[PDB]
Enzyme design. Structure first.
Site, PDB file in Angstrom:
ATOM      1  N   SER A 100      44.754  30.391  42.481  1.00 41.94           N
ATOM      2  CA  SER A 100      44.977  30.201  40.963  1.00 41.94           C
ATOM      3  C   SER A 100      44.091  28.715  40.539  1.00 41.94           C
ATOM      4  O   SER A 100      43.468  28.556  41.229  1.00 41.94           O
ATOM      5  CB  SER A 100      46.093  30.775  39.636  1.00 41.94           C
ATOM      6  OG  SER A 100      44.744  31.045  38.912  1.00 41.94           O
ATOM      7  N   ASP A 222      38.696  41.128  39.348  1.00 39.07           N
ATOM      8  CA  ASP A 222      40.024  39.820  38.511  1.00 39.07           C
ATOM      9  C   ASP A 222      39.692  40.015  37.509  1.00 39.07           C
ATOM     10  O   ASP A 222      38.160  38.986  37.129  1.00 39.07           O
ATOM     11  CB  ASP A 222      39.992  38.614  39.804  1.00 39.07           C
ATOM     12  CG  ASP A 222      40.942  37.991  39.929  1.00 39.07           C
ATOM     13  OD1 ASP A 222      41.505  37.675  37.999  1.00 39.07           O
ATOM     14  OD2 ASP A 222      41.417  37.291  39.412  1.00 39.07           O
ATOM     15  N   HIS A 251      44.336  39.484  40.066  1.00 41.58           N
ATOM     16  CA  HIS A 251      44.516  37.945  39.693  1.00 41.58           C
ATOM     17  C   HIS A 251      45.294  37.467  41.338  1.00 41.58           C
ATOM     18  O   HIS A 251      45.376  36.623  41.711  1.00 41.58           O
ATOM     19  CB  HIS A 251      44.724  37.663  38.917  1.00 41.58           C
ATOM     20  CG  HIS A 251      44.770  36.086  38.970  1.00 41.58           C
ATOM     21  ND1 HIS A 251      43.672  35.259  38.778  1.00 41.58           N
ATOM     22  CD2 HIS A 251      45.756  35.113  37.967  1.00 41.58           C
ATOM     23  CE1 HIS A 251      43.741  34.054  38.837  1.00 41.58           C
ATOM     24  NE2 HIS A 251      45.111  34.366  38.480  1.00 41.58           N
TER      25      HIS A 251
END
Ligand code: NA
Ligand code: NA
Ligand code: NA
Length: 274
Positions: A100, A222, A251
């Site tokens: 991320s 996602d 995610h």
């Protein structure tokens, strides 16, 4: 205290080392989780690599000896702190794996010390969540405000809504329980301030300055990262790059779809772009 200097910064990062080898793999995690997100990757690295794991973005901030240092107010401050970690732990070169926004903290750090990064492996990375007229990050203002929801009104409520949405799949899964667990290890005020940092951060201007090789991996499905984001990063980085979009949801696919994600991650860690 009588055992020595109170090292609160050291405590916030919680740097852990496992494995051995000539190359160090540094593993950074995304908002809401911690270094335990890598539980399915680490066992397959330790034979060949030293592995350095650390916590960030307010992780483990319910631990009363955690202090939210001023450096942590921005992603640039996280990038600075990463460079300090690399210095203190004698990392002369590393394979940086960033999940991320830790992919972006790694990217920012690599512009300053490209010599310290053999490559960056990005997992579920975005340079910016909020849309513009010309950029699809995946979120309109209404979406950001909805996703924020009860985060400061009722943290416990927010987490039960937030966790299954980010992770994807079903609520009772080990992955959603794990993400919920790590969210509850965050002080709710710290979760709120980091959330706001995450959703107001715009790192798109950095991409062209990145020169180290970037392997760009994400789930096809996602909720936080449209498939087009991987190609966006690929087209704009200043060095070598490759994209691999996985037929996975979520995610956090390294936690929720390790059967698919781990083999992909390992290929990108172990093999270089030519
Ligand atoms: Na380099
Ligand atoms: Na290019
Ligand atoms: Na290229």
């Amino acid at each position: 205290g009588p055992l020595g200097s109170m090292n609160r910064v050291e405590a916030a990062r919680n740097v852990h080392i496992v494995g051995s080898g000539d190359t160090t793999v540094v593993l950074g995690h995304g908002f809401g989780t911690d270094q335990s997100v890598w539980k399915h990757l680490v066992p397959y690295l330790v034979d060949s690599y030293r592995v350095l794991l650390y916590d960030n973005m307010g992780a483990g901030s319910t631990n009363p000896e955690y202090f939210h240092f001023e450096r942590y107010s921005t992603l640039q401050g996280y990038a600075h702190d990463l460079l300090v970690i690399l210095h203190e732990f004698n990392i002369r070169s590393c394979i940086f794996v960033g999940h991320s926004l830790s992919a972006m903290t790694g990217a920012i750090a690599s512009i300053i010390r490209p010599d310290l990064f053999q490559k960056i492996v990005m997992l579920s990375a975005s340079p910016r969540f909020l849309n513009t007229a010309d950029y699809l990050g995946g979120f309109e203002p209404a979406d950001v405000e909805q996703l924020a929801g009860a985060i400061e009104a009722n943290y416990k409520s927010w987490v039960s809504g937030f966790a299954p949405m980010v992770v994807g799949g079903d609520m009772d899964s080990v992955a959603v329980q794990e993400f919920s667990r790590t969210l509850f290890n965050m002080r709710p005020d710290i979760a709120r301030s980091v959330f706001r940092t995450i959703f107001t951060s715009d790192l798109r201007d950095y991409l062209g300055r990145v020169t180290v090789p970037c392997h760009i991996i994400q789930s096809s499905r996602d909720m936080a990262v449209p498939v087009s984001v991987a190609g966006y990063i690929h087209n704009r980085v200043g060095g070598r790059s490759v994209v691999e979009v996985m037929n996975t949801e979520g995610h956090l696919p390294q936690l929720s779809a390790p059967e698919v994600a781990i083999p992909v991650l390992l290929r990108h860690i172990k093999n270089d772009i030519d």
